[PDB]
Ligand binder design. Structure first.
Ligand SMILES: [Zn+2]
Ligand SMILES: [Zn+2]
Lengths: 97, 101, 65, 54, 115, 120
RNA sequence: CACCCGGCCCGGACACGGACAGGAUUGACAGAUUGAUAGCUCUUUCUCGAUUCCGUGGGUGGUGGUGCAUGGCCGUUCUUAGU
């Protein structure tokens, strides 16, 4: 869909920082509660994650009414290349042992 | 040290009676003034819904009960002793709320 | 259907539109042909429109006669 | 546009509410803040804590 | 003609406030709660449709989906096309119908004839 | 010294890429330039229309913007980073940006030490 | 809210080709238009910046069909003493 670059990079950097993503499955919700002040509709988060899933970078699961998303090694590679960070930095899901 | 009260609330009776009895005998052996279990009226949550999803049958009804058993134990003891006696007693299937004055 | 068909609005393709904004002379007089939008964010970055009988800004929706 | 998409108010009414599980808006149990369809409650009654006695 | 002991000629000049109590309890409450955008938008269209008209021939029809608009002294003489769900029903707003809604004068269903 | 004068262009543009400091085309470049929030402009010779070169040079000369001069269109676009590349990494699909402008630079000593000295 | 009349929106992922910073596309003041202050569309220009837009493949939605394709619950045979 058509959404500004700010929203796209904000979703991507959150996904890379944490390593997972959760949405509430509602297209009418005003703003994603974690991305408050940034002004990112829930719709954008869902469709961004859908677009990144379709290629095969992120693994999705659906509980009662919530979307769940896990960033894979291909996703880590894609994000590091797209967001332009040095290979030293790794997600919070890949920090500990 | 003044008037700490301890509100034990649970759905199971056996576990609640066991844990509360342990708190009491634990307090009694230390020579502390304890006011015994004040048993409040048991809260019964009732849901009555049709058995069928569709709505064609002989109009049968389920009867779902949920029991809430609440006990109050009161102590005239110092907060330092109250903290450790409340700390040691943990059990999955009881909620404990401690209040002072 | 009773209506023949409802067609979507297609944007009229104009070639190299920002050349109409400036009129540079030989010795170098860079005169702005369209008026500047007097609002805060637009100031020096947005050239307000000139319609047949009015002015208009596409960003802030400011209008003057 | 922006002011006609989800423009209609939904503070009250049957359309404003929905099941927490299946997102259906019929035969909804909104007692004790269950906020769940009657079919879904019957499925999840056991593991919530609701028991059938008498 | 007269409405609640007030002739139309001084209904026109009478303002929005003291007009409230003359109406029945329902309308009084509606005017107390105040009119939204589309109601004003219709009034603007209707007064313009009247203003642009000839002084002898009746104002040109103004079409609307607003069945829930209260008739006002402003609206007396106007030609309103009220939506019934399917089509538009044309009504000339007479002085005597200054309490009711538009919806009442455009019937939704066809009257039943049995067979 | 050892590096070629035009080599700094690629390093500067590819280092300023990450910061989004590269105003692309003319209807973004000119409006950024008119706020005086821009450092350098890069213009190509392959410009069939006359009015384009005289407009950009006049506007750049107006607020004392220094100029780097590139030969053709496609190379500048490839240096800034527009072109899409194949699996082997050869330029397949190319798009030309005749005028580019920069607002913010990165931190490259090998780039900074020569590019400004070309204007001494 | 499935039904009837009328009108916006894509929330058509992903891939391939074309398009394309010499601008793919986005949104809109005014007047006309409309039930609508819906830039929906027409006149007239402005405004956003590879996020899109056009073709094919392929998806994604459904209170669309089929309970005589089905799963799950549910009713009944059948409240009797049956197996
Ligand atoms: Zn402006
Ligand atoms: Zn449900």
């Amino acid at each position: 869909m058509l959404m500004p670059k700010k929203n796209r990079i904000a979703i991507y950097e959150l996904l890379f920082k944490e390593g997972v993503m959760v949405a509430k499955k509602d297209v009418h919700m005003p703003k994603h509660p974690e991305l408050a002040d940034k002004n990112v509709p829930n719709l954008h988060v869902m469709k961004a994650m859908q677009s990144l899933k379709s290629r095969g970078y992120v693994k999705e699961q659906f509980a009662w009414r919530h979307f769940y998303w896990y960033l894979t090694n291909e996703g880590i590679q894609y994000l590091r290349d797209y967001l332009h960070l040095p290979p030293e930095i790794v997600p919070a899901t890949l920090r500990r042992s | 040290i003044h008037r700490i009260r301890i509100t034990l609330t649970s759905r199971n009776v056996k576990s609640l009676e066991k844990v509360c009895a342990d708190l009491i005998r634990g307090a009694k052996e230390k020579n502390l003034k304890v006011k015994g279990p004040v048993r409040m009226p048991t809260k019964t949550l009732r849901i009555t819904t049709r058995k069928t999803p569709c709505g064609e049958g002989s109009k049968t009804w389920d009867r779902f009960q949920m029991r809430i058993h609440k006990r109050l134990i009161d102590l005239h003891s110092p907060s330092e002793i109250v903290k450790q006696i409340t700390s040691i007693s943990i059990e999955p299937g009881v909620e404990v709320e401690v209040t002072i004055a | 259907y009773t209506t023949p068909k409802k067609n979507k609005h297609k944007r009229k393709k104009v070639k190299l539109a920002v050349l109409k904004y400036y009129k540079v002379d030989e010795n170098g007089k860079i005169s702005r042909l369209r008026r500047e939008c007097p609002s805060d964010e637009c100031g020096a970055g947005v050239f307000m429109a000139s319609h047949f009988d009015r002015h208009y800004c596409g960003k802030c929706c400011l209008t003057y006669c | 546009h922006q002011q006609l998409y989800w423009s209609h108010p939904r503070k009250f009414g049957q359309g404003s509410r929905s099941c927490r599980v299946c997102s259906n808006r019929h035969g909804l149990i909104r007692k004790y803040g269950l906020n769940m369809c009657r079919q879904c409650f019957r499925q999840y009654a056991k593991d919530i804590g609701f028991i059938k006695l008498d | 003609f007269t409405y609640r002991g007030v002739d139309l000629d001084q209904l026109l000049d009478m303002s929005y406030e003291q007009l409230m109590q003359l109406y029945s309890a329902r309308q009084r409450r509606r005017l107390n709660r105040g009119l939204r955008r589309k109601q004003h938008s219709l009034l603007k269209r209707l007064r313009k449709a009247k203003k642009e008209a000839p002084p002898m021939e009746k104002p040109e029809v103004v079409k609307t989906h607003l069945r829930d608009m209260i008739i006002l002294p402003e609206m007396v003489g106007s030609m309103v096309g009220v939506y019934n769900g399917k089509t538009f029903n044309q009504v000339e707003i007479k002085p005597e119908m200054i309490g009711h809604y538009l919806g009442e004068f455009s019937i939704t269903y066809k009257p039943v004839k049995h067979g | 010294g050892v590096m070629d004068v035009n080599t700094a262009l690629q390093e500067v543009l590819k280092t300023a890429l990450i910061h989004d400091g590269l105003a692309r085309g003319i209807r973004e470049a000119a409006k950024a330039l008119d706020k005086r929030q821009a450092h350098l402009c890069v213009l190509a010779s392959n410009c069939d229309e006359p009015m384009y070169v005289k407009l950009v040079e006049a506007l750049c000369a107006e607020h004392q913007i220094n100029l780097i001069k590139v030969d053709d269109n496609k190379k500048l676009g490839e240096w800034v980073g527009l072109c899409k590349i194949d699996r082997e990494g050869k330029p397949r699909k190319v798009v030309g940006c005749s005028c580019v402008v920069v607002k913010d630079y990165g931190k490259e000593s090998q780039a900074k030490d020569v590019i400004e000295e070309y204007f001494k």
